[PDB]
Paper text:
Botulinum neurotoxins (BoNTs), the most poisonous biological toxins for mammals, are speculated to exploit a similar mechanism to block neurotransmitter release at neuromuscular junctions that results in fatal botulism. A BoNT molecule consists of a light chain (LC) and a heavy chain (HC) that are linked by a disulfide bridge. LC is a zinc-dependent endopeptidase that is delivered into the cytosol where it degrades SNARE proteins to inhibit synaptic vesicle exocytosis. Membrane translocation of LC is mediated by HC, which can be subdivided into a translocation domain (HN) and a receptor-binding domain (HC).
Interestingly, diffraction-quality crystals of tHNA could only be obtained at an acidic pH despite thorough crystallization screens at various pH. This result is consistent with our structural analysis that suggested F658E may destabilize the acidic pH conformation, but does not directly affect the neutral pH conformation. Notably, the BoNT-switch adopts an almost identical structure in tHNAF658E and the full-length toxin. Taken together, the structures of tHNA at pH 5.1 and tHNAF658E at pH 8.5 allow us to directly visualize how the environmental pH regulates the conformation of the BoNT-switch. BoNT/A1F658E has a ~5-fold decreased toxicity, which is likely due to the energetic costs of burying of an acidic residue in a hydrophobic pocket when tHNA transits into the acidic-pH conformation during LC translocation.
Residue numbers in the entry: 547 to 646, 650 to 871
């Protein structure tokens, strides 16, 4: 029915003489150049649509800015979700994300996946051990032979991580960044549409009446800009949490299962290689055995900081590690 870009158009209007009115019905917003969509509360809708006496005008303005900031800075902190501690509930209603009708519900059941319009390729192919099997095949056993095999194994873990993180960088964050980029738009639209409904009423006030109080829209718009900045802070925090969440719970584990399988196979190989050739050490190979056993028994730690210099992403990842 409605893509993200339609909701974002429901939230626009052409400058005109008419009084424009916010509405919670998306369909209604689109079919009328006067009606504008909002993800704000029905209480907020009512409060702006209602026509306002000249006396109660500045007091009106006060409440809307309070209501704006209340609605915008909304923050749920339900901690039923893994590695997402903050939610911004109005995101879905604003961009048709969690309506793709309970958002926060949607995150709790399905995780951060629900932000992606396009699910990336998650499967990691089987990692074979043929290259190393061939490498040691009729090689006289030495310390360096075993150490090479093990550096190669390290390198493999490094390759799979790089693969996964890059997939994530390219296909996931770009998508999420789009939500961020667009959320800023939706919020800025709502500011422009409220500034419009207000400055409409004020320009129906008689000049002697109007002359009494000065509109000072550069004050208003400005106060609306700071309320948004505060909202983007919540949104960004949230988004980066979701990013690292998806990465660590829904992407990296697939690599790690495969890498573990790889270590395992390599282990068998090398230990057999060492026993088959123990006679080069007059039969005493206990150290070499212990080396491959220790090395391959522990996963190579994943450091997001290899790939990313971002402040937000790395701290979110730091929080992940405990």
């Amino acid at each position: 029915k409605y893509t993200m870009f339609h909701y974002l158009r429901a939230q626009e209007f052409e400058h005109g003489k008419s009084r424009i009115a916010l509405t919670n019905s998306v369909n209604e917003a689109l079919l009328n150049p006067s009606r504008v969509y909002t993800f704000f509360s029905s209480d907020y809708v009512k409060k702006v649509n209602k026509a306002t006496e000249a006396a109660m005008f500045l007091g009106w303005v006060e409440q809307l800015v309070y209501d704006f900031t209340d609605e915008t800075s909304e923050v749920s902190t339900t901690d039923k979700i893994a590695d997402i501690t903050i939610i911004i509930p109005y995101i879905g209603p604003a961009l048709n994300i969690g309506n793709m009708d309970d958002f926060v519900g949607a995150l709790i059941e399905s995780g951060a996946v629900i932000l992606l319009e396009f699910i990336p390729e998650i499967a990691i192919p089987v990692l074979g051990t043929f290259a190393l099997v061939s490498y040691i095949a009729n090689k006289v056993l030495t310390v360096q032979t075993i150490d090479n095999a093990l550096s190669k194994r390290n390198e493999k873990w490094d390759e799979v991580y790089k693969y996964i993180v890059t997939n994530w960088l390219a296909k996931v964050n770009t998508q999420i960044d789009l939500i961020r980029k667009k959320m800023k738009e939706a919020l800025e639209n709502q500011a422009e549409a409220t500034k419009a409904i207000i400055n409409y009423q004020y320009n129906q006030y008689t000049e002697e009446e109007k002359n009494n109080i000065n509109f000072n829209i550069d004050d208003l718009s400005s106060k609306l800009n700071e309320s948004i900045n505060k909202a983007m802070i919540n949104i960004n925090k949230f988004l980066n949490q979701c990013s690292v969440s998806y990465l660590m719970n829904s992407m990296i584990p697939y690599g790690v299962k495969r890498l573990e399988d790889f270590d395992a196979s390599l282990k068998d190989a090398l230990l057999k290689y060492i026993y088959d050739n123990r006679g080069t050490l007059i039969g005493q190979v206990d150290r070499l055995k212990d080396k491959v056993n220790n090395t391959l028994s522990t996963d190579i730690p994943f450091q997001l900081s290899k790939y990313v210099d971002n402040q937000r992403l790395l701290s979110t990842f730091t929080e992940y590690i405990k």
